[PDB]
């Protein structure tokens, strides 16, 4: 990968892997956001940003702080079969002291059509206490100049499904999917659950027939708290719609504590 | 990737991604196992097999046989860092009726030094009823063209640790980790639990300690029955002492014996 020409944005090619592909033979939802994450930190790389997924720089190590996924919202016109290249192009953007957004957009290579897009919303927090702050003018300053500086949007869109307010799912669920538990793959290298974890936690509640007639769309997901590597989690679902959407839920299986909450919208094949 | 320039043995190079790597900034043996099988599934594609992880002829798919892994011995003596570039080197090799044998080289790309080996013994089975069956001239006769003549061992040295007998765990277990799951992520393409889902779950009994002081060196896998996607599982680990451990995956309900294995781990 590198970034391009005029150095706002980074480009990285990937060849499915055969391990990387679902029952259609093309690339799950959750390898896609693996690929997200990457050419994320392969970008931080490339402009002297720390590489732990936080994206930090040595003003904010110093005050202990973080960024942290607030929202994903994706949505895949076409999967990538396995052996195909997929060309994926990042780039990031200040939206006030509110928090930042990384975009993405998906091609393939061969024919150089648009194949997925994605965005992401980020807030800025303190490691150890976990309280949210607003960013301050001298860590917003020393970002500025690795971003566009015109808006430049993947879901440019009137009334856009990315940045829609997202209900809280009422009991009983359709479906469930309870005991789900992180294993050792699951974690990052700071020993945290990986993003990409709580996507397929959410998928867990959908209902097989589902998976094997229709094709993941879109999903949007929340990140409210974190599952920590030995808490116990519940997936939970409710069909809310040709097309199907549903309503998802992922709490904490004692208490009930919200941790996620999306939606998904399927086609069918 | 390609085949290397006799045809007989394939490589194929890989970069070391960030979410692939654990606590110490380098590879984790599941990750290694990943890429092992990637380069098994370009091996088969460039000279006509199967891409599903059984690797059939059309005589083998018209009989409903396929190629199941019944072992795996991989031994690592340094995990690439992220961002490394690993390149790894395999080939079969006919272990008479008995069944086939896949090995592996991996190498730091940059020095050219050898980092890890591994190797697999695998069985033909009748993939419905699952029974398990000699290989036949015919069948075998297809295969000799794709691989090399004289012997070429990843694990040469007479009664290596790759050929040991594994004993079965006796309760109770020093160590457990019990109600493993598998999720739709651990599938593979054919809705089947993926190889190196097992060697995750065995992983998952060690205790925390273990991982945070220690590296792992060397596993030995034996693979005894499959794990449907709706079975639950419980690892258990006892320590037989560098550090050793007997493992031993069995289904949560009745306690039948999926996967036996043993695992050395040396001092950071
Ligand atoms: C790798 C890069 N990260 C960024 C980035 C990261 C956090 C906040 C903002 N505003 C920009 C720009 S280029
Ligand atoms: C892709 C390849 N598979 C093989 C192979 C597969 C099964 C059995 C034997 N004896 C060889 C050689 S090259």
Redesign the interface.
């Known amino acids: 990968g590198s970034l391009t020409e005029d150095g706002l944005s980074y480009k990285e090619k990937f060849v499915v892997?055969?391990?990387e592909?679902?029952?259609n033979?093309t690339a799950?939802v959750?390898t896609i956001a693996?690929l997200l994450?990457?050419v994320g930190?392969?970008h931080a790389?490339s402009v002297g940003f720390s590489?732990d997924?936080f994206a930090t720089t040595t003003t904010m190590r110093k005050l202990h702080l973080i960024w942290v996924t607030a929202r994903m919202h994706i949505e895949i016109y076409k999967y990538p079969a396995?052996?195909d290249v997929v060309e994926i192009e990042t780039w990031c953007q200040s939206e006030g002291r509110i928090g930042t957004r990384r975009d993405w957009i998906l091609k393939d290579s061969v024919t150089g059509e648009v194949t997925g897009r994605a965005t992401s919303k980020w807030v800025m927090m303190n490691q150890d206490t976990r309280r949210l702050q607003k960013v301050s003018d001298d860590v917003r300053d020393e970002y500025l100049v690795f971003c566009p500086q015109e808006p430049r949007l993947a879901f440019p869109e009137e009334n856009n499904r990315s940045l829609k307010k997202i209900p809280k799912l009422e009991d009983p669920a359709q479906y469930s999917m309870i005991?789900?538990?992180p294993?050792?793959?699951d974690?990052?290298?700071?020993?945290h659950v990986?993003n990409?974890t709580y996507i397929?936690?959410v998928?867990?509640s959908i209902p097989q027939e589902i998976?094997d007639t229709h094709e993941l769309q879109v999903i949007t997901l929340d990140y409210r708290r974190e599952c920590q590597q030995d808490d116990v989690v519940d997936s939970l679902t409710t069909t809310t719609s040709n097309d199907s959407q549903f309503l998802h839920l992922l709490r904490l299986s004692g208490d009930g504590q919200e941790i996620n909450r999306g939606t998904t919208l399927w086609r069918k094949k």
Request: hydrophobic fraction near 25%.
């Open positions: 892997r055969s391990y592909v679902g029952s033979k799950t959750e693996n994450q990457e930190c392969n790389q590489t997924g396995w052996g005991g789900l538990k294993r050792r793959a974690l990052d290298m700071n020993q990986n990409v397929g936690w998928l867990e998976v």
